[PDB]
Design a protein around this nucleic acid. Structure first.
Ligand code: MG
Ligand code: MG
Ligand code: MG
Ligand code: MG
Ligand code: MG
Ligand code: MG
Ligand code: MG
Ligand code: MG
Lengths: 249, 156, 138
RNA sequence: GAGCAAACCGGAUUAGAUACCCGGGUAGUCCACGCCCUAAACGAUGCGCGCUAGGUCUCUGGGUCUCCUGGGGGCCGAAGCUAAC
């Protein structure tokens, strides 16, 4: 049953039958206290820390600060970009690079090739040598973009970090704290609530939680201070958040 | 503000590695940079040429400094610190005592801007870990123990 | 069966703090209880309070630390960075008054056990007496 | 005293083989009582006791029993330790 949330998209489900001899284990469902992914233990402990954290995201915001989020799991990545562009800041989906922060003065160079290439495919210099290098410059521009598509907003090392799972993207969190950078992350029982600077004890995994915690973390920024504007947002045309703007091919 | 101190090279070495054909030296410099006002920092970078080796260590130096709590001209109090096998130990001394210590600990203490100490040594008199040796010492000197024992503790 | 009742406590506090526990329990007894009275008046530990566990008396020592730190390894500095036993059993170390220790150049105490209650380098000297040198804390 | 096997008897390989290989063979290995007491008799890590994250596999008793509590064996690992391993 899809409570107006599922939407009938002619989803067959012919190959989706439970004929997968799934009728094999009785204890198949070892079930615990994790049936939908919404845990809040001790409350007087977590809610205390939340206010804490979210009070800073607000501060770093107003102080003009910057917050690059760090995403690495498939269980996020894209969920990192939406909350990325919606909130004008740098993000890292694909993969971290040793030094992303403890080497700026060098990884930032890559960012430069990137921009450099991005210039050339805009001037008449297009096509002046063998297709080979033409592609030699396309591979790069392409790759570079794959791994640097979000680091282009880091003219200088950031005031904070928002890594999802400070245990899977630990290098990130190492590099960070080695440079006195408050590290903000999700974290759970299977994490280092000692390393995480400003914790938000959500579910490390679980798409939903992510989008839930990461969004307000994005909205809180945006709503930093305020203003009038009371005609509210429109529904169906929420494309500026990114969605799937203009395709190529 | 200003980020310039006085540099002192502690001890340099050629290191030699080996390959088909022959050997290949890598140089090691051990430098200490200081203010003589409370800040000092060790550093040892390697290189195929001593200078860079020094310069590098000159950069590693300035990056690892430690504001030393000097009272008058000495260390506020006593400390002995274990390292590899080295056991530097410094003892605060009256004025007019002099530095009084090894090539290494002296190179370090004398930049932290000390003037009167008495040093305890007892193992691996190795220019390197005695170097480091003298520093965690300087990192463990106390500022505000007076505060930590009596102050509240909110948000830890 | 413990061999040195005190030393046990001291240590139980020592490791306890190295892992940053909030408080540790230790077998009760006047002495230990009087020995912790000092660590408490002196700030090394928020405090102790007689407690029961399984039916046997124990003492809950609420350890005290410092603030979290910046950079790698953010664990809080220690309040009791060092706490050794001096006068062990089969090693009784009694010192005169002029033999009382100075300890961590006044940054630390040294609990004595003079025929006049359990005092610290300070007091004991102030009162003018010496006795078994139970420990040295800093 | 079946098999095996120092010494030893022959066979072969070798530049030479009192050796590796091959065919026999004694003490011995076996049991009884007595003697010897050594060992890489090694976890190369004395005994006892208290304290300090976990996870994983496994033997054995209790258990409101595929979870927790006791004893023993392995693995990986917190802090810590170590010259390093
Ligand atoms: Mg040692
Ligand atoms: Mg000395
Ligand atoms: Mg025969
Ligand atoms: Mg040996
Ligand atoms: Mg039972
Ligand atoms: Mg066991
Ligand atoms: Mg291990
Ligand atoms: Mg470790």
């Amino acid at each position: 049953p899809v409570e107006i949330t599922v939407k009938e998209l002619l989803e067959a489900g012919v190959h989706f039958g439970h004929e997968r001899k799934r009728w094999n284990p009785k204890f198949a469902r070892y079930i615990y206290a994790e049936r939908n992914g919404i845990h809040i233990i001790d409350l007087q402990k977590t809610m205390e820390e939340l206010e804490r954290t979210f009070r800073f995201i607000e501060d770093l915001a107003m102080r003009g600060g910057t917050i690059l989020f760090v995403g690495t799991k498939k269980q996020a990545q894209d969920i990192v970009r939406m909350e990325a562009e919606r909130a004008g800041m740098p993000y890292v989906n694909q993969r971290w690079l040793g030094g992303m922060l403890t080497n700026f003065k060098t990884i930032s160079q890559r960012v430069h090739r990137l921009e450099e290439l991005e210039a050339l495919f805009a001037s008449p210099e297009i096509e002046e040598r063998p297709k080979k290098e033409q592609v030699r410059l396309k591979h790069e521009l392409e790759r570079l973009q794959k791994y640097l598509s979000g680091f282009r907003l880091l003219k200088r090392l950031p005031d904070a970090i928002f890594v999802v799972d400070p245990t899977k993207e630990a290098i990130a969190v190492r590099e960070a704290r080695k440079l006195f950078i408050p590290v903000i992350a999700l974290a759970d029982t299977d994490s280092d609530p000692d390393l995480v600077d400003y914790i938000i004890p959500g579910n490390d995994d679980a798409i939903r939680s992510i989008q839930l915690i990461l969004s307000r973390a994005v909205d809180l920024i945006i709503q930093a201070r305020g203003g009038v504007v009371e005609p509210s947002p429109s529904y169906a045309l929420v494309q500026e958040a990114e969605a799937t703007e203009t395709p190529e091919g | 503000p200003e980020t310039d101190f006085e540099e002192k090279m502690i001890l340099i070495r050629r290191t030699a590695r080996m390959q088909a054909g022959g050997r290949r030296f890598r140089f090691g410099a051990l430098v200490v940079v200081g203010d003589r006002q409370g800040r000092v920092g060790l550093g040892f970078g390697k290189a195929p040429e001593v200078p860079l080796a020094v310069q590098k260590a000159g950069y590693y130096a300035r990056r690892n400094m430690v504001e030393v709590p000097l009272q008058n001209g000495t260390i506020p109090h006593e400390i002995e610190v274990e390292f590899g096998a080295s056991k530097i130990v410094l003892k605060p001394a009256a004025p007019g005592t002099g530095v009084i210590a090894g090539a290494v600990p002296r190179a370090i203490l004398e930049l932290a801007g000390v003037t009167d100490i008495l040093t305890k040594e007892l193992g691996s008199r190795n220019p390197i870990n005695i170097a480091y040796a003298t520093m965690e010492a300087l990192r463990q000197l106390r500022t505000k123990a007076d505060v930590e024992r009596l102050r509240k503790g909110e948000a830890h | 069966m413990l061999t040195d009742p005190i030393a046990d406590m001291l240590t139980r506090i020592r490791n306890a703090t190295r892992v940053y526990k909030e408080s540790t329990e230790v077998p009760a007894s006047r002495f230990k209880e009087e020995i912790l009275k000092i660590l408490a008046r002196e700030g090394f530990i928020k405090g102790y309070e007689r407690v029961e566990v399984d039916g046997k008396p124990y003492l809950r020592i609420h350890l005290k630390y410092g603030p979290r730190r910046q950079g790698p390894d953010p664990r809080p500095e220690q309040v009791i960075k060092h706490i050794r036993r001096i006068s062990r059993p089969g090693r009784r170390v009694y010192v005169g008054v002029k033999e009382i220790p100075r300890v961590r150049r006044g940054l630390g105490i040294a609990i004595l056990s003079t025929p006049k209650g359990v005092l610290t380098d300070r007091e004991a000297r102030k009162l003018g007496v010496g006795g078994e040198l139970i420990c040295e804390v800093w």
